[PDB]
Amino acid sequence: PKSIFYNQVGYLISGDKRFWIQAHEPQPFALRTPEGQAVFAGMTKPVGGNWYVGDFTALRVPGTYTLTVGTLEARVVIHRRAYRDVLEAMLRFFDYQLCGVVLPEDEAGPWAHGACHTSDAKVFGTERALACPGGWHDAGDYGKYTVPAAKAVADLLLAHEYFPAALAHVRPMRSVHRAPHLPPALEVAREEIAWLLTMQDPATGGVYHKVTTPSFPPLDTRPEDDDAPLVLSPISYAATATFCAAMAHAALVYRPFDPALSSCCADAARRAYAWLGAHEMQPFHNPDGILTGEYGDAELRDELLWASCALLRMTGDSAWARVCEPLLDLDLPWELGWADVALYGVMDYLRTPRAAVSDDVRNKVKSRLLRELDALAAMAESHPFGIPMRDDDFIWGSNMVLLNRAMAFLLAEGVGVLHPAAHTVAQRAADYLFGANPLGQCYVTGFGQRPVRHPHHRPSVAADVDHPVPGMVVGGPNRHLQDEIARAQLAGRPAMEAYIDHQDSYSTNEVAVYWNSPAVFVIAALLEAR
Ligand SMILES: [Ca+2]
Ligand SMILES: [Zn+2]
């Protein structure tokens, strides 16, 4: 497959521009207008392994150019807002996943419905029932889970706070949101917050782990065709803590837009934390008779960290610094979910007014955060595609691992922790996700020259349209070959090549709400840069 590897979505006018080829020496290259006029030229340079890169960043005039190097040819496009449409489709994906709510045909097209899982969820072990209407279907399945929901919400909320201008005029589905009509990111994220609120037991303040069917309906199964009884898995520490942090964050962001919802989230967060103080950290386990997504976790101190730090920033009360800061000194991995969420708390802590926290602890936190970014930067400098990844990092949901890492750079920039490689990593992450990889694969449905055509997504599989729901970020290459398709097809291939666009490859070609949400953040960042 001797080919030119590039960002198949496009390049920003004022953005960094790079293409990849396999070679053993530098080669001259050139870009020409559609009419054949040479407008740019340069030399490729080695970046490790068999890989060479070409840099045409200085080419600022928008349009479609013919890139030539050696005998190889490719067409790249430069646009003022090249990632405008893909960002829109990425946020619109959340509306496509909406549950218990009719999606109008004029907006949802061939994947329209219809109200799925309207059944009042029976609490596990009992006959009492609460109405738990979504909200979003988590992944390719239709299950709704509290823990990963908190990440998806937090990311979209963070995307709004950081890059409101880039998201200001993206349009979610028209007839599914209420008043006051919020900025698109907040307009979309509110739906998941609303469902999450109904997941909190008013009796104990605790939060149910997941409301799903007992088992997984077939890949072919339509949402409404899935009418199995809805189980309500027990309250868990992880569910309550992540709920608490997400609500405290929601209560803070939505205040100048929806004061009514802001008030409701704040009270829900406090009650949720009250539960944490009276219950031990117990790892969730699937109830007997439940085989849906467990989303378990044995380490729960980072959840408490996030919950504490979120309430710290929500209240601005230095009383929270007493519980936050000891947890911040722990050697927990500072990551962005869904299981390891410590960095979310770190950010809330750093975005808290300096007068409410300890200076020496704040300096230590900033110092560690920079070290972590330094390590990622070193990884990106060694990687041929400039992304903060090693071979053993390419596991289940490697694209989220990548995107979370790019997000960490951009988040830290917002709190005065500026690493010089931050915006380079952001572009490289987008390049990789949009085709700049050993497979030349655009890992987003409905975009690029080699798009994802057969994702592990039941609404997409159900419809016989031979093209899935657009704007879905798939899991990406997984070296552990954790499905029957991958183990047969992808055996022997390098980590970055451990992907296949097969609808039955759920460990490489699955989608998720918490996979699109960091994608929204990173892509919005690139558009905001202008
Ligand atoms: Ca954890
Ligand atoms: Zn549903």
Short mmCIF file of all heavy atoms in Angstrom, two decimals, residues 297-303 338-341, ligand 1:
data_model
loop_
_atom_site.label_atom_id
_atom_site.label_comp_id
_atom_site.label_asym_id
_atom_site.label_seq_id
_atom_site.Cartn_x
_atom_site.Cartn_y
_atom_site.Cartn_z
N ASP A 297 -14.89 -0.81 38.62
CA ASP A 297 -13.68 -0.11 38.99
C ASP A 297 -13.33 -0.39 40.44
O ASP A 297 -14.18 -0.30 41.33
CB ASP A 297 -13.84 1.40 38.76
CG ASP A 297 -12.54 2.16 38.91
OD1 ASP A 297 -11.46 1.54 38.86
OD2 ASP A 297 -12.61 3.40 39.08
N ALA A 298 -12.07 -0.74 40.69
CA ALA A 298 -11.62 -1.11 42.03
C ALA A 298 -11.01 0.07 42.77
O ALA A 298 -11.06 0.13 44.00
CB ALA A 298 -10.62 -2.26 41.94
N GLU A 299 -10.44 1.00 42.02
CA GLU A 299 -9.87 2.22 42.60
C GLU A 299 -10.87 3.36 42.54
O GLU A 299 -11.22 3.83 41.46
CB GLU A 299 -8.57 2.60 41.88
CG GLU A 299 -7.95 3.89 42.40
CD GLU A 299 -7.68 3.85 43.89
OE1 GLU A 299 -6.67 3.23 44.29
OE2 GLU A 299 -8.48 4.42 44.65
N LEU A 300 -11.32 3.82 43.71
CA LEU A 300 -12.40 4.81 43.77
C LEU A 300 -12.00 6.13 44.43
O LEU A 300 -12.84 7.01 44.61
CB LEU A 300 -13.60 4.21 44.51
CG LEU A 300 -14.27 3.02 43.82
CD1 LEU A 300 -15.30 2.37 44.74
CD2 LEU A 300 -14.91 3.47 42.52
N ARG A 301 -10.73 6.26 44.79
CA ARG A 301 -10.25 7.48 45.45
C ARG A 301 -10.17 8.65 44.47
O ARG A 301 -10.31 9.81 44.87
CB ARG A 301 -8.89 7.24 46.11
CG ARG A 301 -8.95 6.36 47.35
CD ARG A 301 -7.55 6.04 47.87
NE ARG A 301 -6.79 5.22 46.93
CZ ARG A 301 -5.52 4.86 47.09
NH1 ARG A 301 -4.85 5.26 48.16
NH2 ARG A 301 -4.92 4.11 46.19
N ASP A 302 -9.94 8.35 43.20
CA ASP A 302 -9.90 9.39 42.18
C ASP A 302 -11.31 9.92 41.91
O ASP A 302 -11.48 11.08 41.53
CB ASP A 302 -9.26 8.87 40.89
CG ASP A 302 -9.93 7.62 40.37
OD1 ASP A 302 -9.73 6.54 40.98
OD2 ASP A 302 -10.63 7.70 39.34
N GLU A 303 -12.31 9.07 42.12
CA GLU A 303 -13.70 9.50 42.02
C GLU A 303 -14.04 10.46 43.14
O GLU A 303 -14.71 11.48 42.93
CB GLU A 303 -14.65 8.30 42.04
CG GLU A 303 -14.85 7.62 40.70
CD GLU A 303 -13.65 6.81 40.27
OE1 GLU A 303 -12.76 6.57 41.12
OE2 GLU A 303 -13.58 6.42 39.09
N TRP A 338 -12.75 6.63 31.46
CA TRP A 338 -13.92 6.77 32.33
C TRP A 338 -13.68 6.20 33.72
O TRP A 338 -14.36 6.56 34.68
CB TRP A 338 -15.14 6.08 31.70
CG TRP A 338 -14.92 4.63 31.39
CD1 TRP A 338 -14.57 4.09 30.19
CD2 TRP A 338 -15.05 3.53 32.30
NE1 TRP A 338 -14.46 2.73 30.29
CE2 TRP A 338 -14.75 2.36 31.58
CE3 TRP A 338 -15.38 3.42 33.65
CZ2 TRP A 338 -14.77 1.09 32.16
CZ3 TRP A 338 -15.40 2.16 34.23
CH2 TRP A 338 -15.10 1.02 33.49
N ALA A 339 -12.70 5.31 33.84
CA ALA A 339 -12.40 4.66 35.11
C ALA A 339 -11.45 5.49 35.96
O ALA A 339 -11.61 5.58 37.18
CB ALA A 339 -11.82 3.27 34.87
N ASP A 340 -10.47 6.10 35.32
CA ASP A 340 -9.51 6.95 36.02
C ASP A 340 -9.77 8.42 35.70
O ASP A 340 -9.41 8.90 34.63
CB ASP A 340 -8.08 6.55 35.65
CG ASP A 340 -7.83 5.06 35.81
OD1 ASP A 340 -7.63 4.62 36.96
OD2 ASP A 340 -7.83 4.35 34.79
N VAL A 341 -10.39 9.13 36.64
CA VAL A 341 -10.90 10.47 36.39
C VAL A 341 -10.22 11.56 37.22
O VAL A 341 -10.77 12.65 37.39
CB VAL A 341 -12.42 10.53 36.67
CG1 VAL A 341 -13.17 9.56 35.77
CG2 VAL A 341 -12.70 10.22 38.13
CA CA B 1 -11.34 5.39 39.59
#
